[PDB]
Amino acid sequence: PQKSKPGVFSFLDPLAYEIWMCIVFAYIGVSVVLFLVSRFSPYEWHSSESTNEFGIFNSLWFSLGAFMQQGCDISPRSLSGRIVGGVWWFFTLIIISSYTANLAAFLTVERMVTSALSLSNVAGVFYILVGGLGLAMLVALIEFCYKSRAEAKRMK
Amino acid sequence: KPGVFSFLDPLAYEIWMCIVFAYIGVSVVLFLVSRFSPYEWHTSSESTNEFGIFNSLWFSLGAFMQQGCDISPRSLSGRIVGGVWWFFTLIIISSYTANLAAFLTVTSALSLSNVAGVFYILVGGLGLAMLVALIEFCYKSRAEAKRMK
Amino acid sequence: KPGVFSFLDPLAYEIWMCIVFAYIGVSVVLFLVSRFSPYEWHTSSESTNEFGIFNSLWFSLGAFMQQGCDISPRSLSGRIVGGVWWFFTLIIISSYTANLAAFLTVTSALSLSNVAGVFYILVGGLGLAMLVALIEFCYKSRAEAKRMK
Amino acid sequence: PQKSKPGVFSFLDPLAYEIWMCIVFAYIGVSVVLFLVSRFSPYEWHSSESTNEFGIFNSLWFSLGAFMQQGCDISPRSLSGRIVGGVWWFFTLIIISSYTANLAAFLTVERMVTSALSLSNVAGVFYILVGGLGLAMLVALIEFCYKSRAEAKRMK
Amino acid sequence: DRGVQMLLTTVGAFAAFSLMTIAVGTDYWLYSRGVCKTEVMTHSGLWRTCCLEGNFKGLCKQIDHFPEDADYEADTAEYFLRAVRASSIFPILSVILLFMGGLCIAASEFYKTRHNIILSAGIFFVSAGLSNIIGIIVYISANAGNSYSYGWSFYFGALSFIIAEMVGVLAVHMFIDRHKQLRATARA
Amino acid sequence: DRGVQMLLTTVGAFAAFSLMTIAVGTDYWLYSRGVCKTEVMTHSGLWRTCCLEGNFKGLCKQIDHFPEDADYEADTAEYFLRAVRASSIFPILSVILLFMGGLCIAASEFYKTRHNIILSAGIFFVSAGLSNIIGIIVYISANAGNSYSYGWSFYFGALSFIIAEMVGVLAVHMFIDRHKQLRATARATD
Amino acid sequence: DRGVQMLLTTVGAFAAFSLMTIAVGTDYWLYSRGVCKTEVMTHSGLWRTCCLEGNFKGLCKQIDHFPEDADYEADTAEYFLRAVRASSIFPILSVILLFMGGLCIAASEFYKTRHNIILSAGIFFVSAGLSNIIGIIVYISANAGNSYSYGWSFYFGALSFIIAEMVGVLAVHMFIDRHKQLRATARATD
Amino acid sequence: DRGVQMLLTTVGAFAAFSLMTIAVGTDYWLYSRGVCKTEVMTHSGLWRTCCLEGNFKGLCKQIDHFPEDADYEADTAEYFLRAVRASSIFPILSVILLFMGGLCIAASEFYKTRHNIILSAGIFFVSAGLSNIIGIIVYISANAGNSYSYGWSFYFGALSFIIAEMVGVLAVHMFIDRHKQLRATARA
Ligand SMILES: [Ca+2]
Ligand SMILES: [Ca+2]
């Protein structure tokens, strides 16, 4: 039959589905453990502010930045937090090195059921990026609308 | 026959054009979601964050180039934009590196003729930056001279 | 037959051992050149920089893992150490990635069996960190209880 | 004849010697231009301190960190400084992507005149690292000795 | 200046809207090999294809968005992409959003006491730019689905996207400055 | 907001415990070709595999966790993995940790004076999730040694892990809030 | 320290100008096999190539910068590169910029009241180095279209570039120090 | 405490020196195939090689650091590496630096008024660790120049390197604290 071009989500091809699910679970667990070891101790607090900035949302942001090879403006300072960060960094290095080794080959595989990369092979990432931009705009607008309504209700 | 700009071969021209368009759009949306709402301004008014349009463009350029960032978004929508841009950057840069490695092995050392274009671009950028700095300097000097009159 | 820790295959075991030794030595030398001299302490005394032994180890680990850094050396000798460590890290990590790409193509998706070891290591590290935090917490609680007596 | 293993400095094999020399020249030029556009204007100054931290030494450090894909605690803030930084980032991306594509193959090439990497193939980088550590220790000791002698001379 | 910013925003919005309308209407998007009756150089747009040389110059054809193919084993993603390209819903949506942003600008000119209209115009312009990006990606992906070139209608669309993003930035800045002025007046 | 947070924590803890218990108990973990007699589509869990449809529908057979013959003792890692999978010690440990966390929550609601109990509960929940993760990996690794699919017991376990993480975060937040109140009261009284 | 800095800047500017002038003038840029008649070891510069040793030692021939035949025009970039190499506009521009920087240094030492001149000098030096870099690349690219080596004229040019960068940095430092003194005097008088 | 830090530094320095001396002296560095008279399992060290099984157990040979090879086309780098390995100058230098650091520790114990002796001891320990790293790399590279294993002398050397780095860190901390105390006394 006709050759089957890779799907719109072919960027997930290099890793199996179980690997992706385990990566999601590991990311959630790492963020939760980082937040717990960073904020649970009452002796890490000072009306009172924590010594570190690693809340649950900030822990998730730090873990996502570490996995994306980008980084953020914060970094763990405690011993246990730094252990979590280092082990997550090692996991990220291994997994990303495995994933990015042959990404283009998975993006341009032909199946029956060298050349430059075409826009058709990477259209899915563009679609996801534009969808994320739209979602962020909608979330910001919703928050603005909510705050404006609350301020108006307070005024009258 | 590879040319001076043969380093752009692994990606198609449409991919480069759409990368530029996506970069512009991401920077604009990041600035919009970071600065539009009046509830992030507190009493010349000062914003809680520092994500202006110029700062947003700098952040997006740094994120795409896999370089360090001076600032990071803190809001929910700004972080959504940053995360989706990080995902896009990871996929695109990884694909470019994989395709470049495939291209380069079609063990011979790389020649200067194959990468002369990037040197030309770098020198042109340095000249443009020096010209811009000098223009700004002489403009400010003229403004100060007019003020002193 | 690749095992659970097959991700370490591209580099020999001696390379990993020497990487660990080099990391320890680089951290120690960075701390030494950053903190030994009494002329970088100004009036509990405070240092001009923040490169203690623990901070030096964290900096070296972050540099080797291609992750963001909280601090950067500012002195001449500290920057020499940082630059040579950056060069070493670039060479070693690039060689590991190139050899891993060679290994993985001896287009089949990677299986969970090939990377189960890194998940085991990650979970063990999380458990160790939680245990360390709990130990420190209960130690401090005992100290506070003794103080209140 | 017998197979010739790659030399102690085989990590420079992927790029030609002219490319390395041009990289050194480009690094020097980029650092100099960054410092010039960051510090020359009297309107960027405030007994008086500059708005930015980009002296010549700091410019060289920033350029080296950008080329090493590591980064530092400073980043250009002016328009011209950011132009220099962005063009240097693009140059670094292209050159490093070209250099690291097949580093292991150049490290393990056999000539007459897959397998795991051995320590013999990467002994040169270890030698250079230890030499740099020794040089840094010597420089720190020399500075300490100089300052101690100056303080002693001031005392008496 | 508020007046200068208003003039620049209006001029940019009109320019982007006109460029998008011209790009959608015109049929010089692509130059490639093809036929114009019922394999020569031919310029095609979103709707029509016409050969610019040969014995059949001028007379030309509608694009067969759903050609008489084998019709067997056609993925739903392929059909979705083909339908989206055939409708050209994203370029038309970009045109509509640009028109709505211009209408918001005019209304704010007539309703200077209301400040949310500036924000609405900025949102419309940014959304139009995003829709244009999606439309360009869809058009190129459908085209790729061997020597060709892009005409001036494609570049008109790209310029319209850039100008729309610029005008959205200007409108957001205008909204920010108006709220800053309101806060300064209330505080003083 | 303390009552709402505590109600959410209790409900989530019970839900995660029930989901993990059901996932361990039920045998709809994997759908694959096999035989239930000591080839046909079968559903297998952690303990037994049963044939659906066919002439032997509804017949269940205990899973043999030590396949092959000749007892090739060339690797100890494979035997360790087989023993861990056969014992299923990690899913059961996750269930036990969830039960202990729920018990700690009940004890905290009873005493209403010892804050550390709350903290302990949170740890248990987080620990449970970690154990859950390991179990999942082990299970998939055990399937390494024909298209297959995962049943609703696998996703029940995954949902249990997610809810356990959420409940652990909520418990840690409650602990932090209790210490905030304690610090505020101490500041007021001093 | 102003006098020491000015002396260093002047000496470095003169050295860089002399090195660039010698590199452009001399013909020991490249050692390679070739012929100096219109194969033997020859040394070639920017303009002429001469045979060393052999029966035609000491004979110099103008370099033909437009090789091959049929005058193929499929590429304009190649013709641009060949024209740029034949003109050698970038090394000569670097020499001119170094001369202008030295002239600006002399004019600044003469007037001793106009600070901007100093700044201009620095720019020239930096600009010269940039031009130098381009020339080097162009030259090597021109050699793309047998083992070879580079003579002492190539390294004279490289040293000229390095010294030009150093002198530009020194001139910028002198400009900054002059504005520091101006600001200090203004603060003292106000 | 100052006394506890003194005791830990002295104990670690003695342990590292003893481990390095034992590793250099002993001949259980590597297990590999080889001969012991004039291809069986054999343990070899820096100087001697001895087969641990067979008909020639015990009686054994000095390592031929410069074997009777073809002698043609011997690179200068290869000869330099072979000479460095044959001399074992880096393990011996590590032993000497550890001994000098211990001597500095003893002198500082006898010369408590002088603080630069602590710094000298720390520098000696760090240098000994660096020399040990270089020696390990040289030994492995020369060995590689097919089934083998590493004995307990190699691991004794590695442990000595780790302990030496730890003791250097402790000595540097000691120097820092002594200077801090001097500054505090002068300031107050
Ligand atoms: Ca980075
Ligand atoms: Ca690669």
mmCIF file of C-alpha atoms in Angstrom, chain F residues 70-138:
data_model
loop_
_atom_site.group_PDB
_atom_site.id
_atom_site.type_symbol
_atom_site.label_atom_id
_atom_site.label_comp_id
_atom_site.label_asym_id
_atom_site.label_seq_id
_atom_site.Cartn_x
_atom_site.Cartn_y
_atom_site.Cartn_z
ATOM 1 C CA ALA F 70 17.328 -25.650 32.724
ATOM 2 C CA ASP F 71 17.418 -23.116 35.598
ATOM 3 C CA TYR F 72 20.070 -20.939 33.958
ATOM 4 C CA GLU F 73 21.671 -19.194 36.944
ATOM 5 C CA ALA F 74 23.976 -16.994 34.882
ATOM 6 C CA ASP F 75 22.486 -13.702 36.120
ATOM 7 C CA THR F 76 21.257 -12.824 39.600
ATOM 8 C CA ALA F 77 19.542 -9.595 38.512
ATOM 9 C CA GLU F 78 16.988 -11.553 36.480
ATOM 10 C CA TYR F 79 16.230 -13.843 39.425
ATOM 11 C CA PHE F 80 15.896 -10.804 41.693
ATOM 12 C CA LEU F 81 13.451 -9.182 39.266
ATOM 13 C CA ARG F 82 11.428 -12.399 38.987
ATOM 14 C CA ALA F 83 11.289 -12.808 42.775
ATOM 15 C CA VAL F 84 10.251 -9.176 43.283
ATOM 16 C CA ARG F 85 7.525 -9.494 40.643
ATOM 17 C CA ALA F 86 6.266 -12.807 42.049
ATOM 18 C CA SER F 87 6.115 -11.428 45.588
ATOM 19 C CA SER F 88 4.484 -8.181 44.379
ATOM 20 C CA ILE F 89 6.003 -6.654 47.502
ATOM 21 C CA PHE F 90 5.864 -3.090 46.167
ATOM 22 C CA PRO F 91 2.113 -2.796 45.379
ATOM 23 C CA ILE F 92 1.320 -4.457 48.717
ATOM 24 C CA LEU F 93 3.758 -2.123 50.479
ATOM 25 C CA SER F 94 2.009 0.816 48.808
ATOM 26 C CA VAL F 95 -1.348 -0.470 50.079
ATOM 27 C CA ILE F 96 0.093 -0.850 53.591
ATOM 28 C CA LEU F 97 1.547 2.671 53.505
ATOM 29 C CA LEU F 98 -1.787 4.115 52.353
ATOM 30 C CA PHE F 99 -3.539 2.304 55.208
ATOM 31 C CA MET F 100 -0.972 3.647 57.685
ATOM 32 C CA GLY F 101 -1.444 7.177 56.353
ATOM 33 C CA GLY F 102 -5.205 6.910 56.752
ATOM 34 C CA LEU F 103 -4.752 5.576 60.280
ATOM 35 C CA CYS F 104 -2.462 8.512 61.080
ATOM 36 C CA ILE F 105 -5.074 10.928 59.716
ATOM 37 C CA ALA F 106 -7.727 9.352 61.946
ATOM 38 C CA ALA F 107 -5.404 9.478 64.965
ATOM 39 C CA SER F 108 -4.667 13.155 64.299
ATOM 40 C CA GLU F 109 -8.382 13.930 64.024
ATOM 41 C CA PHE F 110 -8.828 12.122 67.345
ATOM 42 C CA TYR F 111 -6.005 13.645 69.412
ATOM 43 C CA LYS F 112 -6.148 17.127 67.811
ATOM 44 C CA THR F 113 -3.028 18.140 69.779
ATOM 45 C CA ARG F 114 0.000 16.289 68.313
ATOM 46 C CA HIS F 115 0.973 17.945 65.033
ATOM 47 C CA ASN F 116 3.804 15.543 64.143
ATOM 48 C CA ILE F 117 1.245 12.795 63.462
ATOM 49 C CA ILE F 118 -0.049 14.863 60.537
ATOM 50 C CA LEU F 119 3.485 15.080 59.161
ATOM 51 C CA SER F 120 3.911 11.323 59.508
ATOM 52 C CA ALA F 121 0.703 10.772 57.550
ATOM 53 C CA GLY F 122 1.984 12.912 54.705
ATOM 54 C CA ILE F 123 5.268 11.023 54.587
ATOM 55 C CA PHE F 124 3.398 7.728 54.357
ATOM 56 C CA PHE F 125 1.330 8.972 51.434
ATOM 57 C CA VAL F 126 4.384 10.241 49.576
ATOM 58 C CA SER F 127 6.239 7.031 50.386
ATOM 59 C CA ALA F 128 3.286 4.993 49.142
ATOM 60 C CA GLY F 129 3.393 6.767 45.803
ATOM 61 C CA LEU F 130 7.107 6.109 45.461
ATOM 62 C CA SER F 131 6.538 2.424 46.172
ATOM 63 C CA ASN F 132 3.717 2.453 43.627
ATOM 64 C CA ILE F 133 6.080 3.825 40.984
ATOM 65 C CA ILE F 134 8.605 1.060 41.603
ATOM 66 C CA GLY F 135 5.911 -1.585 41.361
ATOM 67 C CA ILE F 136 4.730 -0.237 38.023
ATOM 68 C CA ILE F 137 8.238 -0.357 36.592
ATOM 69 C CA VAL F 138 8.811 -3.859 37.939
#
